[PDB]
Each structure stands twice: as C-alpha cells, then as structure tokens.
Amino acid sequence: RMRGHQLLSADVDIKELAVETKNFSGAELEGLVRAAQSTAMNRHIKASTKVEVDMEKAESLQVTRGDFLASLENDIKPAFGTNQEDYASYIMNGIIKWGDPVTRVLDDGELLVQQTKNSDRTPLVSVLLEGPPHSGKTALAAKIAEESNFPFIKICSPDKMIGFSETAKCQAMKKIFDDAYKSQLSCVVVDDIERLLDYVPIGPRFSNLVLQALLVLLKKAPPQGRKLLIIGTTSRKDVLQEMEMLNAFSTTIHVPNIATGEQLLEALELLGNFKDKERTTIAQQVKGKKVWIGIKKLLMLIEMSLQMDPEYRVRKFLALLREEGASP
Amino acid sequence: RQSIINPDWNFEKMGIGGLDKEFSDIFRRAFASRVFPPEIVEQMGCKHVKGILLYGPPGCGKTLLARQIGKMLNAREPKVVNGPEILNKYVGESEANIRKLFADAEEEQRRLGANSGLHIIIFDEIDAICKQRGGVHDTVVNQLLSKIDGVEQLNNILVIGMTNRPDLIDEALLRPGRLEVKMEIGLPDEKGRLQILHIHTARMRGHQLLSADVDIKELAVETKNFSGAELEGLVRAAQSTAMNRHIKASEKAESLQVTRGDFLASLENDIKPAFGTNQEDYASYIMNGIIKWGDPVTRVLDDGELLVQQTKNSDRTPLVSVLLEGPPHSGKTALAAKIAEESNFPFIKICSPDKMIGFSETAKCQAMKKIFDDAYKSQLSCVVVDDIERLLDYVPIGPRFSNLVLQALLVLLKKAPPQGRKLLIIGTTSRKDVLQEMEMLNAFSTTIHVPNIATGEQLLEALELLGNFKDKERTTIAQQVKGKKVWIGIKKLLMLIEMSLQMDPEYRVRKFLALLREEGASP
Amino acid sequence: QMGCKHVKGILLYGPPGCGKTLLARQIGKMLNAREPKVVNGPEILNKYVGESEANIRKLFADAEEEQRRLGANSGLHIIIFDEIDAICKQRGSMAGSTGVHDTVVNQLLSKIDGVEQLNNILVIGMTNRPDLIDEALLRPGRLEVKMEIGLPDEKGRLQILHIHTA
Amino acid sequence: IDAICKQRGSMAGSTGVHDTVVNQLLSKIDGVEQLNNILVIGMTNRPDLIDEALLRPGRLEVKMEIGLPDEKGRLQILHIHTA
Amino acid sequence: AIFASGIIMDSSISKQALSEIETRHSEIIKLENSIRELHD
C-alpha cells in the first residue's frame, strides 16, 4: 500500500530487512514499520512555539533505509531474538590474543558448533568449560555463543536470582528451557554452576533439588526436528566430579593461565600501558623468572599501580607482582 | 476540522524542566501522526499508537507530565481511575466497571467512524490491578486485554499508565498494539536543577520580592541528587521561614524579602534528601573523634584516598572493594566511616546489623537488595558493611550460619552497576581465618590491617593526647611501663581509664596499673 | 502574590498517652475548621474484597464536593488517623511476594495526591513506630513535618497539675 | 445430574438454595405419597459426588459403568458407522 | 476469591393497597349521580 502511491524510496531493499530480522513475531514488523513512518514524518514538524506545519516540503516526503535502521536499533526490541547489550556487558574489555590457548579454545568451540547443525544422530550435545579462578572463562563462552550465529541465544546466570528460593530457581530454569524449545536452533549458557547450587566447603552444604533438576534437564531431547546446544562454566571441577555430574557432559575444555615471561610481555604490549623505557626494565626483571596470574588479576594490578607517581609505577607494580607471586 | 493541539498552547507555559528528550520522544512517537495533513496519512494506511507507560523513583515528575499531556489536547475531558477503585465483592462487578469506561468511545466510533474525536484514559497505580497471570486478579486482566484489542477495532483512544514497580506488570500488555512506549524518569542532573529552580522562582521575581544577594547558580551547584519535589520543598520552607520571621519581628509589609540566610537555614535544617549524605550516622559512629596516636592511623588514611581516587578516575575498573580486619576493639568501624566521609561522594550509606534485630534471612536479604538497588541509581556511591560475622550469625559451636545471606553477599560483590556508573564497597570483620575458610577472601580486591598498640611510647602519646594525667603521674606510669611492652586496644584503654577515674584522688594510679596488668595478654 | 501552596499534613510520633489527640483537636479548633473526622487504623481492615478502599474513600467525599461547589472559596477540613502505622507498611518488591494490605496503601497514596488537586484539606497522623512507615508517604509532598512528644520534665508535671487542679 | 445434586451442607456460597432444592427433590421422588408411573434416568461424570442418601435402594437402584470398548467393540463400531 | 451471590424477595404487591383503593372509589358514585341530576 505504501509503494502504491510512490511513497517508498528506491534505495530500500525488503529482502535485506527480512534477512536481518531473525525470529520477529508478526506484530513487531508492524511496530517497526509504524515507528519508521512516524520518525520520517517527524522531520517536518518543530515543537517549540505555536505548532506550525511546513506545508511546502510535504511533496518531497520519502522514507530512507536510515530511518528503518534507526527504528530497529532504538525503538523495536524483540523477545525471542538476540540483543547486543548482553554481549556488551559480558565482553566489556573485549578479547585479545595473548597466546595459543585462546585460538585452540575458539577452534574447539567452532568445531562443536558445526556438529549440532549438520548431524541427525546426536541432536543434543553439551560441553563444560573449567579452569582456575580469575582465568576469564565466561568471556570465552560469550564469544563462542556470539560466533555461533544461532537465531535464539540466551544466558542464564544467577545475577538475576538474588534472594530466590530453590523452588523459584527451579521454576525459572524450567521456564527458560521450555522457551528454548520453540526454535529450530538454540544455545544456552550456564554460568558459575558452583553458585547455582549454593555450595560451601563447610559441611559441605548445597541444594539437592537444584542439582537434581539440572541433572535431569541435561538428558532430555527436544521435540523431533529441533537441535540445542548447552555450554556450562565452573571453577571447581573435583567437586562436580564428586557428585557424579561429569557423566552427563560430552567433553571438556581447559583454559590455562599465563605461565611465561614472553606471554606476559606480549599481553602488556598489546594492552598498551607502559612505555618502552619501562618495558626494558620490566622485561629484564621478568624474563629470568616464571609467573602465574590470570588476565583479570593482571588488569586489576595494572590499574592499581597506574595511580602512583610517574617515577614510582614500575617499582610498585613489581612489588605487587612479587607479593601476589605465582604459588603454583 | 479543528486541530488537535489548542491554538494557544506553548511549551514555555507547561512549567516542566529537565525532561526535554523524553517529551521529544513522546511527541515523535505518539502525536506525530495526529498532526500531519490527514490526506497524506490516509494513503499510508497506518494506525496510531494506543498506550504510554512511565516509570521511575518516587518524586520525579510523572503525574505532572500526565496531567499536562491530558490538558494539552483539545479532546474531551479525560477519565480518572484513582488507584484500585474498581474492585467489588459481588460475582461480576469489576468486569462491568472496566467495560463501562470504553462505552463512550465505542459509541462515538460507531456513530461517526473516521471523524470521531479523541478519548483519553488515565490509569493510576496500574500494578495494583494488572498483575501477571498465574480468582481475585485474573478476571480483570482478561477483560482489560480483550477490551484494549479485541475482535472489533478502535482508533480513538489513548491509555496512559503509571507505576513504581514496572517489573510486576504483565508481559502480554507490553507489546506493539498495546502500551509499548515505555519511558523512565530519573533524578535530574545539574541543568535540570537550574531549570526547575528558574521555573519555581519566576512569579516571585516578577514582583521584585527576591533579594539581590541570592544567586540561583550556587543553589543549583550545592544541591546534589535532589529530586524536583525536594527543590519545591526547599523553596516553600525558605518562604515560610521568611514570612514567620517578618510576622514575629513586629502594616509592616512592603519590606518583606527573601535573603540567602533563609535559604541556607532551610537547606541545613529543613530538607533532608533521600539519596544524599546524612551526618547523623557519622556523628553516631564517630563518638570521640580520631586521635593520631601513631603511624598506622596515618598509613591507613593515606591508603584509603588512593583507592578512592582509583575508583573515581579509572575507566576499566568500575567496581572496587576492600576489607579492613584486625584484633577486636581496635576501632575498625570508626576508620571505615572516616574513610567514607573523606571520599566526598554524593551518596554514602552504612548497613549495620543493629537495624535488623530479630529479622529472618528473607528480610536481611531484602534489605541488602533494596540498599544496593538504591545505590545503583546514582552516578557515584559508597556503601559500607560492618560486622559481617553478625550478619552471617556465626557461632563457634556447630559451626552454624545462614547460607542464603552468604550466597546473596557473594553474588552482590561481583555484579557491576549499569554502564557509565561506578561503585565502591568497604567491609570490616574481626575474624579473618573464618572468612578465608568459607572461601570469601578471594572476592575482595584488597585487604588492609589495623594494628593494636604495641609500644609504651604510643601509649604515652595517646595518654598525652587524651589529657587525663598530670606530669608527676605521667612519669609515675612511665617509670613502670617503659620497661616492657603492652597490648591493648584504644576502646579498652578508654574503658579502663574511665573505670580508674572513679577511685579516690590518690589511688587512681594503683588501680589503673592493676587493671592494665590484669587485662594484659600475650602479644 | 507569592503563590505558595500550604502544607498537606503532619506526623506525630511518641509514647502512648502523653497528649497527642488533645493537641490534634486544639490545632483544628484554632483554625476555625469544621468538625474533625477521627478514624481508627485497625478498625478499617476488613476481610471482604474492596471494603477497606471504600472506607478510605468515604472520608474525602465532603472535601471534594465542597471544593467543586465553592471553588477556591471553600473553608477547611481535617481528618485524623489513629495507629496509622497499622495500615501503612513497606511494599514488597519481588514478584509473588507481595503483602495482604498493599491495595489500602495504594488507595491512600492516590487519594492524598492524585491527578486532581485538593486545597481545602489537612491530615494529622499519630503513631508509635515511625520506622515502619512507608517511604513514599514521607516526601515533601505528603506528611512533610514530623514531631516527637516525650515524657514531661518537672516543669511539665507542675503545669499539668496546675491545669488539672485550677 | 451432578450440577444440581451434591452432598448437602458442603457449599461455601449461597448454599441456602442448594440444600432446599436437594431436599425438595428427595421428598418428591419418594415421600409420603406412593407413585408407580415415574421413571428417572440420570447421566454424570463424577459418580462419587452424588449425595449418598439419593443412591439408596428405592430411589436410584440401577447403576451402570460404561468404559472403553474392546477389540470386538471397535470391529462393531466401525461396521455400524460405514453401512 | 472471597465473594458471594445474592437471592431476592419482591414486595411490589401489597395486600393492603386493595382495601383503601377500592373503598376510596366506592363513594364517588353517589356524588357523580347527584351532580349529573343537578346539571340536568
């Protein structure tokens, strides 16, 4: 109807918008179109004094793809799709290549993602990521999920379940996993498993109902004709193995820490904080030793050391690194 | 046809400031298609928006905006639903009341069609009726959903909703074709404060009642994290103070004027912001000042501001933490309070276990969550936690404690605030080892140590600063204390001094020495 | 000429039986106000649905009708509550964990300051536990003045004996 | 017949009408006057909700339970439905 | 779901609105006859 009266520009491609919008319900397309039309119309109205309509440019009113892009980015937010705010809040400081393990982990993730798309005998595969604390294992999972390119991607973390009872957590997990069954492809990421059970070394204590609900939900195949991928993160592996929970998982991936002077120097150079003169001394000090520190801890130490005086940063940074040490 | 917007309406008269972007977006999305020439709109064949939702903290200008929007349009007088006034007891009354609201709109639409006038419906405290589904609240939501968008179509209605808890609102009522334009009204930054003061001090200036020594810029800069309602309260209190002073001083009119002194007094005594700094807490927790009895106090004070400046200036670390620990009766809470006060932040709060006497776990968790949520709606904050072991209810027997509170505290110590904001959490404790066993020391970014008095010289310096004993008595103690070391806290020392001071004028020293010897322990 | 609105309510918190109702009656009798409407907190509550709200709303009809009839030339009205804290408590935030008396608080908040403005009313509250009151009911728009009445000192006892023995 | 007949003294609404209705039905079906030309047939889906005093011999004796057909039942239903 | 339906008891028929209404009109017949005779 809009194109009937030559109201649509000649630089708007419908197929591009159709491909861009993934898993958009019917009403959201109408909402997007209405928002774009309203934004286009608003360009000829000024609201600061007695309302006056510029009736001279009304003959050159046209809708440009820029309006559609702006309305999509700002106004319309889907519900069964994906949003870029989660990846902007979980990949805050980005990802950098400080060695070989990152590439290997990314390759393994990509290989796992290809199987759950071109396979008919295993329509449900799960993997577990584990490592020492402060090793940055959630960012890698988020990056893998983003690079999967599946239509429906969701992240289930305990950050939204503060104060909830075990029953509430179980009924949130059930709701999420049920909503995940209404698509031809889906990825679900479980974050900090050892904090979804309320584990505490003393006793030890934990929630049995949540553990059972999680053990029963890892072996339920979706409706015929659909696929699913489950990723999970955890920093205490032995504890999970003790409760006989590693059987449900199909494989495992190990994320190591920095363990050489060259890797630390490369990471420092990539970050771009210290000058070359200081780099000379820091290399001369580190090369003849070994280190054991995570990336997050290194960033925090660098930030804390940067607050000193111009001619005291290096000494305090070295003192902090030695105090923390390695403790293999 | 007469235009929808009154010919005599103008923004300057609306009397609203600090909400330019929100009003511009509302006008662009809602009323944009109701002002263009109808002949053009007819070709596009597009339906108008049917709802608007506004949410935010108490006292920021929601109802005012709805009233102005209602009185802006040339439509007929709007309806009003003051809270949940549609409930009733007989089986089949709430639905009838709900249906009775849309009768006139449907009748007018049937009678006229595409030339009907506009209707307005204003809902107040919507979250008290429209709650998520799943026989007291599930047969009004269905009626409302069916009426808003049913088998028959309507194009001459507009629903405005208001609430303080947007999360509890149903989900099926917030989709396109329904109340979809959602806006948030938040504490105003500086320009908003200046605009609000100018709006609220306009009539008085026209009649030359404002003194010449009052500058609105200083008032705007001084008041931080106030909300419009608070600024209005401040002005009214100043005016009332001036009027009361004039009347009580002594026909005597024509000389009344508002001066800077009245504004200062009203701000200092009358107005207490909800998201601002309160000096009563600092007065209550620091009851004997701070005395520099040795290096450790200076070291701690020179370490605290470094962390404060790190959290204030950096950009890759929007969250910082620290833990103060030491032997009992060492004065940790006072040092933490002083460090917080010296930060000069615009939002400081202290959470202590003495306001939760007899509270269950599911109340302490709620209190902590509410405090953190409040701290999350300001561009800077500082939350202090003291007596962690009392929050956890730890007892050596067992051991026994609350797991839910521990998990909530652990989760709340790593969740960063929204993008662009910063936070700083300080915590104290007197039992480090137990915290380490529970695997809690791995979440704090740094730790600090406050030492006890370990040398006679420090004790003599503290006694001098206190100013209790004279030179002869001072030397009397020095002769016996300088020959060895001591181990006593500041609070215990004050208690011992107070206990000793109640003896006879000549026997104070002997009892003080006896008490010190009895209390003395192995370092 | 200044154009300043009047205060809309006050709150008095203190030990029971120290002279709070008497002061409330005298303050009304001093401003040439009409008969004050006294209401007891715990008596408002009811078990049927939609009965507490009706009782809360029944106390404002006269003010609204007088304001409508006489416009801005109406007199003054006063409403006094008793154990107000027993009908106003902090509202829950988590979904599915709300209280049983939130509708009453919502209705009171809507009536005290809603879309339509009333300028011929005044509210006095008296309580003993001022720390259990909601937060939205203490902002400068409502109940913006709080006072404490304590146990009397020697001068107070002497004056009380004088008054009661004169 | 289960909508209007139920165990008396159980409703928590306006039971003042249901008890009277059930009592009137009981009195009329078999009371002081003897009838010999009346036949009552009743269907339902909740056998255990009907009032016990109404199922005593003399008022409602014949009770039948209809279940799922067996193999010969299916081989007969299909034949009936395709003549 | 605390609520309850209600039952009604009509009164639009009063057995005491038939005595006075009938007795009242029974006395105007003589007056009408007398006035008719007077007019004739």
Ligand SMILES: Nc1ncnc2c1ncn2[C@@H]1O[C@H](COP(=O)(O)OP(=O)(O)OP(=O)(O)O)[C@@H](O)[C@H]1O
């Ligand atoms: N190559 C990298 N690998 C991992 N993290 C990286 C890398 N480059 C940058 N980062 C940053 O490291 C930060 C570490 O945060 P994250 O929550 O993933 O840590 P974690 O050690 O897995 O968690 P936890 O503290 O709960 O044990 C991420 O925010 C990411 O921004």
Ligand SMILES: Nc1ncnc2c1ncn2[C@@H]1O[C@H](COP(=O)(O)OP(=O)(O)OP(=O)(O)O)[C@@H](O)[C@H]1O
């Ligand atoms: N930007 C502003 N300009 C002028 N006045 C303002 C502004 N914001 C708030 N106010 C003041 O707000 C008061 C009305 O408050 P309002 O009705 O918006 O409260 P609210 O947010 O609905 O409160 P609550 O939800 O707690 O009931 C008026 O006195 C008005 O002066």
Ligand SMILES: Nc1ncnc2c1ncn2[C@@H]1O[C@H](COP(=O)(O)OP(=O)(O)OP(=O)(O)O)[C@@H](O)[C@H]1O
């Ligand atoms: N320089 C100082 N440092 C610490 N406290 C001081 C100092 N000078 C005086 N004080 C007094 O020390 C008192 C110690 O009180 P506080 O509650 O902080 O003690 P604490 O030892 O941290 O607590 P707890 O008894 O719970 O272990 C404070 O009331 C303050 O009056």
Ligand SMILES: Nc1ncnc2c1ncn2[C@@H]1O[C@H](COP(=O)(O)OP(=O)(O)O)[C@@H](O)[C@H]1O
């Ligand atoms: N300041 C006072 N002056 C005179 N009488 C007082 C005073 N304070 C209390 N009383 C007396 O105390 C009694 C109870 O007062 P009342 O206000 O009814 O108490 P409550 O606050 O419990 O309602 C009355 O007889 C009143 O005269």
